[PDB]
């Protein structure tokens, strides 16, 4: 399964250069955009964390957490472990997901694609949505693991335009260069 992704990442993300590094972000963001298209997510945050890891937050319904009859596993686990989202998981040292749903925070983490523990309720919550955080694997991204804020921001702006009505932001939390841009193109209320 995902072991094939780790050994032939070029076949799944096109390049293991800086281009592939950035592609990981778009694979995750595309899931959030699908939840905006479904009509439930209204706001997406993309964050470059101080260690060049990435957090993507949406306020949609939250990935389904119920057990699937076919797999016997929670749907959210299958999202990350069965062969875009699972490709990002495979090519990350660690990926953690938090699903905010029905007053509960469901949490699972993976390491180089492998499950750490069964999905668990860790907290109560009043919000809804999905947060994915991932650390790209330098064993895969041997040229660079350093994100380009302008490159991400340029595409985030384009995505806001193409998904008119969506609020989407990009934030850099790295030392000496903290920045944030927020985008929102108005609908019929304009
Ligand atoms: C950082 N965010 C993020 C990241 C991410 F990797 C996945 C999701 C994600 N946010 C999500 N929200 C939903 O919402 C749904 C809730 N309920 C249903 C029935 N479908 C979708 N579903 C999600 N799923 C379920 C599948 C439907 C199409 N895309 C797949 C991933 C995500």
Write a concise keyword list for the protein shown above:
190 residues, 6 helices, nine-stranded mixed beta sheet, alpha+beta, Heat Shock Protein 90, DNA gyrase subunit B, globular, binds the ligand CNc1cc(F)cc2c1[nH]c1nc(Oc3cnc(C)nc3)nc(N3C[C@H]4CCN[C@H]4C3)c12, 29% strand
Query: Structurally, how many domains make up the residues?
Result: 1
Q: Estimate the helix proportion, in percent.
A: 25-40%
**What would CATH call the class?**
Alpha Beta
- The count of β-strands is 9
CATH superfamily: Histidine kinase-like ATPase, C-terminal domain
First-residue to last-residue Cα separation: 48 Å
CATH topology name, in short, is Heat Shock Protein 90
Order of helices and strands: HHHEEHHEEEEEHEE
Largest sheet: 9 strands, mixed
Strand content: 25-35%
Present as ligands are:
the ligand CNc1cc(F)cc2c1[nH]c1nc(Oc3cnc(C)nc3)nc(N3C[C@H]4CCN[C@H]4C3)c12
Instruction: Supply Rg.
Output: 16 Å
- Helix segment tally: 6
> Quick one: overall form?
globular
Account of the protein in words:
This protein is of the alpha+beta class and 190 residues long. The chain has a single domain (1-190), classed as Histidine kinase-like ATPase, C-terminal domain (Heat Shock Protein 90), CATH 3.30.565.10. It is 30% helix and 29% strand. It has helices at residues 2-7, 10-13, 18-37, 75-81, 85-90, 149-162; strands at residues 43-48, 54-58, 92-101, 104-111, 114-115, 120-124, 129-136, 167-172, 179-184. Strands 1, 2, 3, 4, 5, 6, 7, 8 and 9 form a nine-stranded mixed beta sheet that branches. A hairpin with a 2-residue loop joins strand 3 and strand 4 (104-111). The protein binds the ligand CNc1cc(F)cc2c1[nH]c1nc(Oc3cnc(C)nc3)nc(N3C[C@H]4CCN[C@H]4C3)c12. The site of ligand DOO has 16 residues, from helix 3, strand 2 and strand 7. Heterotetramer, composed of two GyrA and two GyrB chains. Within the heterotetramer, GyrA contains the active site tyrosine that forms a covalent intermediate with the DNA, while GyrB contributes the cofactor binding sites and catalyzes ATP hydrolysis. It is found in: Cytoplasm.
């Amino acid at each position: 399964g995902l072991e094939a992704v780790r050994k032939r990442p070029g076949m799944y993300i096109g390049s293991t250069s800086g281009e592939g590094l950035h592609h990981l972000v778009w694979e995750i963001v595309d899931n959030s955009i699908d939840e905006a298209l479904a009509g439930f997510a209204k706001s997406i945050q993309v964050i470059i964390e101080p260690d060049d890891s990435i957090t993507v937050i949406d306020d949609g319904r939250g990935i389904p957490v119920g057990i699937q009859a076919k797999t016997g596993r929670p749907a959210v686990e299958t999202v990350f472990t069965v062969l875009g989202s699972s490709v990002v998981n495979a090519l990350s040292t660690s990926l953690d997901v938090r699903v905010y749903k029905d007053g509960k925070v469901y949490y699972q983490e993976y390491r180089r694609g492998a499950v750490v523990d069964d999905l668990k309720v860790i907290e109560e919550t009043d919000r809804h949505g999905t947060t994915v955080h991932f650390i790209p694997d330098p064993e895969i991204f041997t040229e660079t693991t350093v994100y380009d804020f302008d490159k991400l921001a340029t595409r985030v702006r384009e995505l806001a335009f193409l998904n008119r009505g969506l609020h989407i932001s990009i934030e850099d939390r790295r030392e000496g260069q903290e920045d944030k841009k927020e985008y929102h193109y108005e609908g019929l209320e304009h």
